[PDB]
Structure formats: C-alpha cells, structure tokens
A paper describes a structure:
Gsx genes encode HD TFs that are conserved from Drosophila to humans. Gsx2, as well as its paralog Gsx1 and the fly ortholog Ind, regulates specific aspects of neural development, including dorsal–ventral patterning and neural fate specification. Gsx/Ind proteins have two well-defined domains: an N-terminal engrailed homology 1 domain involved in transcriptional repression and a highly conserved C-terminal HD required for DNA binding. Prior studies revealed that Gsx factors bind DNA both as a monomer on individual A/T-rich sites and as a cooperative homodimer to two sites spaced precisely 7 bp apart.
To determine the structural basis for Gsx2 binding to DNA, we solved the X-ray structure of Gsx2HD bound to a 15-mer DNA containing the -TAATTA- consensus motif. The crystal structure of the Gsx2HD–DNA complex was determined using molecular replacement and refined to 2.2 Å with an Rwork/Rfree of 22.04/26.45%. There are two Gsx2HD–DNA complexes within the asymmetric unit of the crystals, forming a butterfly-like shape, which display a high degree of structural similarity. As expected, Gsx2 forms a canonical HD fold composed of three α-helices, the third of which, known as the recognition helix, fits within the major groove and makes specific and nonspecific contacts with the DNA. Also, the Gsx2 HD has an N-terminal arginine-rich motif (ARM) that lies along the minor groove to make specific and nonspecific contacts with the DNA. First, the glutamine at the canonical 50th position (Q252) of the HD forms water-mediated hydrogen bonds within the major groove to specifically interact with the thymine base at the fifth position of the -TAATTA- motif on the sense strand and the thymine base at the sixth position of the -ATTAAT- motif on the antisense strand. Second, an asparagine residue at the canonical 51st position (N253) of the HD, which is conserved among HDs and is essential for DNA binding, forms a specific bipartite hydrogen bond interaction with the adenine base at the third position of the -TAATTA- motif. Finally, the arginine residue at the canonical fifth position (R207) of the HD, within the conserved N-terminal ARM of the Gsx2 HD, lies within the minor groove and makes two direct hydrogen bonds, one with the thymine base at the first position of the -TAATTA- motif on the sense strand and the other with the adenine base one position outside of the core motif -AATTAAT- on the antisense strand. Collectively, these major and minor groove interactions of Gsx2HD bury ∼825 Å2 of surface area at its interface with DNA and work synergistically to allow the HD to clamp around the sense strand of the DNA macromolecule. The most striking deviation is the ∼20○ bend observed in the DNA due to Gsx2 binding that is centered around the N-terminal ARM within the DNA minor groove.
Numbering used by the authors: 205 to 261
The structure:
Amino acid sequence: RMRTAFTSTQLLELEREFSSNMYLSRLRRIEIATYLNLSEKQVKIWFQNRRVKHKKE
DNA sequence: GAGCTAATTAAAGC
DNA sequence: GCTTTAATTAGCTC
C-alpha cells in the first residue's frame, strides 16, 4: 500500500486513546475510526505499531 | 479464525 | 544520507 499521513489532531486523539485503552474492541475501533475520519485498518495498525514502541520504552 | 506479537520492509519528511 | 514510522508477513494462540 501507500503510507497514510495523519494531521496533528488525529495523532493527538489517537494518543489520548492509547493513554486510556491500549487495546480496542472491534467496535471501539470502528467508533474511533468514524470520529477521526480514518479507516478501521488505519486505526488497527496504528495501535499495533504504538504498542511495539511503548514496550521499547 | 480473527487477532495478537516480532521481525522486517521501505516510504515519509527532512 | 539519516530517523521515524505505516505497512506487510510469518508465526502463535485461544
């Protein structure tokens, strides 16, 4: 695929979620996606990569 | 059987 | 050329 870019707002809301939840139901993933104007796959992969980063730190 | 972690790959912006 | 990170893949597990 081609890489997605996120606005500063989207990144800040995605990282507010990761602060509370670190894992998401399939339903919450669709919620966040619709609120953020993102697709479900974009939210899913962001959360996967974020967890990898969070362990390394 | 979707969904998770790890290890990559390589595209994105400088 | 460099660093950060979105995306893919192989493997495991309930």
